[PDB]
From a paper:
ERs and their endogenous ligand, 17β-estradiol (E2), play important roles in the growth and maintenance of a diverse range of tissues. To allow the crystallization of ERα bound to the environmental molecules acting essentially as partial agonists that are unable to induce a stable conformation of the LBD, we used the ERα-Y537S LBD mutant described previously by Nettles et al. (2008). The structures display the canonical active conformation, with helix H12 capping the ligand-binding pocket (LBP) and the SRC-1 peptide bound to the “AF-2 surface” formed by helices H3, H5, and H12.
Finally, two compounds, BBP and chlordecone, were not engaged in any direct interaction with either of these polar residues, the latter being indirectly hydrogen bonded to E353 via water molecules. Among the 12 compounds tested, only 2 displayed a fully AF-1–independent activity. In contrast, ferutinine, TCBPA, and chlordecone acted as ERβ antagonists in both the FL and ΔAB constructs. In a similar manner, Li et al. (2013) observed that chlordecone activated ERα in HeLa cells, but it was unable to do so in HepG2 cells.
Numbering used by the authors:
A (entry chain C): 688 to 696
B (entry chain A): 305 to 461, 464 to 547
C (entry chain B): 304 to 461, 472 to 548
D (entry chain D): 687 to 696
Write the structure that this text describes.
């Protein structure tokens, strides 16, 4: 999930 | 938790410092825009704004205290409301027009290019008109935006663990209410005026919720009409609904 | 000039309490509804009958009959489903985990599954009921909230008069919280919490409108012309 | 034409 990724970095 | 100990002035300061930037579109006055290409411009812009929104959310007091699953859910629920209220805020000084970007200022008649966009444009214009009617302040606006992020998903969340989560968001929300009242008191409003204005401000969030759901339906329409290109992140955000 | 602005807070509350519509019963099918058609039949039948009472309730909300007929039509068209849903949630409050559509029709989310797309709205309604329950929502606060919905949900789809009546209802809510002994900080905090739920009620109504439209297109049950016209106004 | 118009007037 793109949003999942973006929140993590 | 750092969020819960913040003072009213520090909350305002933290929210003002976290404000994302205003981005430019690829609009070219000389280039002819179809129904589609104007929609490609706006969805291109929204996709870039979503990246800044995600990183803005991390700076909202209390947001990073939540599980990453909770963070994902709040943004999935709130993202369109947040884009729209920012659009309304930017357009407040341009009556009858929507300032999608500093180089892209559209009016109702041009919003008739994309089938279905006229109705949502009118609601956004009606909201901007209300913001002007109430003389909405920038400090009030950043409070409203953080309330949307925290509130819009807090009732569609399991265990007693996921319930302590919901309980923390409520304390942060109450802190933002205290901040709103603090601002109105400083501006010299009577207590009756502070409560009336507080209510007027939060009632707008119902209209923003309404516009968001109408907008989510328009974006899903665009999607499987498959004429306007749509980014992978927008498509995932769309699927969340 | 409108009589609504001259009433007191207590007169406002009493006028709102007196205008409350009755709680209606469902058809007495002694069968636990387990089919989509019988489910949708019972509920839309109830909704049709409640709508007639809502329209007559709305005429007793102070300030409402002072608007033009076209404005009254517009406000009710925009708000009718929010108002039915907040009433459902209110009636269901003292029944955790269940939705009291009528005293003889109390359902749980297991029965929301009998209808395609219904368990999702069912869970939103149940969460709202629990939220009201934990906040100890009072009947005087509930009737203020319901009238705020009526006057607010369509007011930006156009004003001065409605916003003054809206302010008057805010004053009434505060008045009710002060009477209950709450501190000033508790008063504006509780006012905020209450009004923020109206955002969730708006969301549930939008999802409910979508579901009702799909069931219209599914032709699962005949809908009354009144209910159809209330639906059509949301395009 | 709408039923709502008529019920509001009754
Ligand atoms: O401001 C938006 O985010 C919003 Cl809310 C609208 Cl108004 C809709 Cl409803 C459409 Cl589909 Cl018309 C489009 Cl292109 C999207 Cl992606 C943007 Cl950029 C506009 Cl302009 C969406 Cl979802
Ligand atoms: O409470 C309602 O008014 C509401 Cl809001 C729901 Cl929850 C939906 Cl969304 C469905 Cl279609 Cl499930 C149905 Cl049958 C309708 Cl007619 C009633 Cl009676 C329910 Cl139970 C509608 Cl519009």
């Amino acid at each position: 999930k793109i949003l999942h990724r973006l929140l993590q970095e | 938790s750092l969020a819960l100990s913040l003072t009213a002035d520090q909350m305002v300061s933290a929210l003002l410092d976290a404000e994302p930037p205003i981005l430019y579109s690829e609009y070219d006055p000389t280039r002819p825009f179809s129904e589609a290409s104007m929609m490609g411009l706006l969805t291109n812009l929204a996709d870039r704004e979503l990246v800044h929104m995600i990183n803005w959310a991390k700076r909202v007091p209390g947001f990073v205290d939540l599980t990453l699953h909770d963070q994902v859910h709040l943004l999935e629920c709130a993202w369109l409301e947040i884009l729209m209220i920012g659009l309304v805020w930017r357009s407040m000084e341009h009556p009858g027009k929507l300032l999608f970007a500093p180089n892209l200022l559209l009016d109702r008649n041009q919003g008739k290019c994309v089938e279905g966009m006229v109705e949502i444009f009118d609601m956004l214009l009606a909201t901007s008109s209300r913001f002007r009617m109430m003389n909405l302040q920038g400090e009030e606006f950043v409070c409203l935006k953080s309330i949307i992020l925290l509130n819009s998903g807090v009732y569609t969340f399991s265990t007693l663990k996921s319930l302590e989560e919901k309980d923390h968001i409520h304390r942060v929300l109450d802190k933002i209410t205290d901040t709103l009242i603090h601002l109105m008191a400083k501006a010299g409003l009577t207590l009756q005026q502070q409560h009336q204005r507080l209510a007027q401000l939060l009632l707008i969030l119902s209209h923003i919720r309404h516009m968001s759901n109408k907008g989510m339906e328009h974006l899903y329409s665009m999607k499987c009409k498959n004429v306007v290109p749509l980014s992978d992140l927008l498509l995932e955000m769309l699927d969340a609904h």
